[PDB]
DNA sequence: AAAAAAAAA
């Protein structure tokens with residue numbers, strides 16, 4: 001319902017067949033059973049790359065909070081290289 | 087346009103539908119003029135659909151199944167006319183396709199005996215009937231396209247090509263082009279083909 | 288004359 005959003009988000013499960021392309025997605029932020037950072041969606045779940053993430057200041061980024069994730073998928077492994085989070 | 091990939095197969099079909107000219111010589115007898123193409127591959131790789139498309143788009147073609155045919159009845163038959171009371175030859179499946187193209191499915195499942203009936207046609211493009219007092223040579227200058235499955239359920243790329251194909255080399259040497267197709271699993275191709283097939287439906 | 292089922296090799 002936001003005024004700005006009328007770019008469109010993409011479900012997690014639709015990230016399997018594409019790579020080297022930017023995407024926007026949101027979901028629950030938490031830790032997997034292995035111990036890495038993952039995002040959850042009703043469609044599915046992916047992993048998170050944090051090494052080059054610039055977050056929007058003014059928020060308490062805590063596990064269990066919905067976050068808008070922008071980054072580039074990589075099908076070489078399963079790492080979603082996030083470039084910003086808000 | 088509804089078949090994804092197989093571009094070289096499409097080019098081969100295009101060149102086969104309008105193949106080269108036949109040659110005749112006062113001393114060299116006769117030279118074959120057209121092209122025959124055989125394809126082998128693991129199941130569910132869109133061979134029969136391409137065969138049906140070639141049937142639909144050709145000027146003249148006849149559909150034939152390996153299991154549902156008999157070689158002796160494929161070329162000619164002996165039938166007694168009810169009016170004249172005499173027996174006359176009835177044209178077989180391949181004779182009707184003179185100057186046309188014949189498509190055969192389940193070729194590797196087709197009986198070995200009748201295979202020789204095909205080889206004769208591949209030899210001089212003429213069938214000879216000598217039975218019940220009729221001695222005639224019938225012209226059949228058609229091209230044949232066939233698709234067959236390997237001996238195993240799926241193609242083994244690590245094995246001898248002769249090992250994977252049940253047909254003897256004697257007739258395999260006749261075909262000008264041999265094509266082997268495999269459905270290699272790749273997520274990019276899987277997504278592309280899934281999008282295409284969903285678009286078609 | 289040509290297709291289809293049965294028992295023995």
Ligand SMILES: Nc1ncnc2c1ncn2[C@@H]1O[C@H](COP(=O)(O)OP(=O)(O)OP(=O)(O)O)[C@@H](O)[C@H]1O
Nearest residue numbers: 088089090091128129130131132133134135235283
């Ligand atoms: N590249 C493709 N584009 C579109 N449809 C395809 C493609 N590959 C396979 N198919 C689909 O696969 C299905 C299998 O078709 P078909 O039986 O004719 O294939 P085949 O490779 O000839 O298989 P078989 O060995 O069983 O005869 C079809 O419904 C066809 O639409």
Ligand SMILES: [Mg+2]
Nearest residue numbers: 130133134135
């Ligand atoms: Mg098929």
